[PDB]
Amino acid sequence: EMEKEFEQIDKSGSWAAIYQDIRHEASDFPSRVAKLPKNKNRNRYRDVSPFDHSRIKLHQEDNDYINASLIKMEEAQRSYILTQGPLPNTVGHFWEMVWEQKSRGVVMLNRVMEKGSLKCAQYWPQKEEKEMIFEDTNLKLTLISEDIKSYYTVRQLELENLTTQETREILHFHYTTWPDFGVPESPASFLNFLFKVRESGSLSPEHGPVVVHCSAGIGRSGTFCLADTCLLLMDKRKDPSSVDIKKVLLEMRKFRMGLIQTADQLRFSYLAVIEGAKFIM
Structure with missing residues (x-):
């Protein structure tokens, strides 16, 4: 179990x-x-x-x-x-x-x-x-x-294809409180934000994939996808403690280099998944 691996x-x-x-x-x-x-x-x-x-x-x-x-x-x-x-x-x-x-x-x-x-x-x-x-x-x-809100902003946008005059509604989820240096002290507001994105339907298979970015698209963006995927696998598996963060991260690194930029972001990802698992178990 990852909680003991963490300690x-x-x-x-x-x-x-x-x-x-x-x-x-x-x-x-x-x-x-x-x-x-x-x-x-x-x-x-x-x-x-x-x-x-x-x-x-x-x-x-x-x-x-x-x-x-x-x-x-x-x-x-x-x-x-x-x-x-x-x-x-x-x-x-x-x-x-x-x-x-x-x-x-x-x-x-x-x-x-x-x-x-x-x-x-x-x-x-x-x-x-x-x-x-x-x-x-x-x-x-x-x-x-x-x-x-205190920790994030949600925007409804209308995107219009001027060629075909089709319109779609796009939701913009903006996490505004990640600090300039290091990682948040507590994963609580990050988890709240991840549950708000889930609740919107944006991560659901009836839509195309969510677009996730930070500046490079590897560091904070990596932490978001890693936490979401690990919590979903803990819901799906017979044994939730078979979920190894390190293996999931390496599987995700097959698709884009550099996901999780620092040892502090890795520690934060463990903390987010450990704390999110309490709200899911």
């Missing part, structure tokens, strides 16, 4: 050591499309690339590339798209991807500015009466409503 690693202070064994066992697949010179300005970080085998392709004939991966968790029956925070020049590609994949929810785990630098373009409208038009991808985005 062992914590009492022995072995988090950096566990973390390094995960780094050393992690998959390495080619990322040739990401490294093409025509794609250099579609990547926020030169060391964070989608693998070719799992990358999302845009349906535009010119250049199909976006920095985004499909993470398919076969046993849990959950998919996720993990992507970077959009750049000024990729906001239109981001919303094209949401449209094409039939996503219902976007999960944002960063602020637009952190540590005095921009982590993400402002890719949604701030006021009802000032909609955004993405001329490169022929989409319109309107803010319908905004519900601001």
Whole structure:
């Protein structure tokens, strides 16, 4: 059981050591499309690339590339798209991807500015009466409503395909309180946020995969998917304690590199799953 594994690693202070064994066992697949010179300005970080085998392709004939991966968790029956925070020049590609994949929810785990630098373009409208038009991808985005809470904001958005005049409702879940440095002290508000996303229907198989991002789409984004998948597997299995976080994380690392960026994020992920299991058992 992971609670006792947690005390062992914590009492022995072995988090950096566990973390390094995960780094050393992690998959390495080619990322040739990401490294093409025509794609250099579609990547926020030169060391964070989608693998070719799992990358999302845009349906535009010119250049199909976006920095985004499909993470398919076969046993849990959950998919996720993990992507970077959009750049000024990729906001239109981001919303094209949401449209094409039939996503219902976007999960944002960063602020637009952190540590005095921009982590993400402002890719949604701030006021009802000032909609955004993405001329490169022929989409319109309107803010319908905004519900601001202590730890997160939920926004209803309308996305309109200007080519076909179809509209969809998109839910934006914005976790606003992750600290600039380190991880939250308690996983309580993070779990509350994860249960709100679940309650919306955004993670359900009647929609396309949820889009999840932070700045790079690997660190905080990784913690979100890992916690969700581990708690779902504990509901599904005859023996909930057969669930090994380390194995789930390595299975997820087959689809996108670098998920869980620090030993502190690994410790936080254990704490989130351990605490979430109390609300589920």
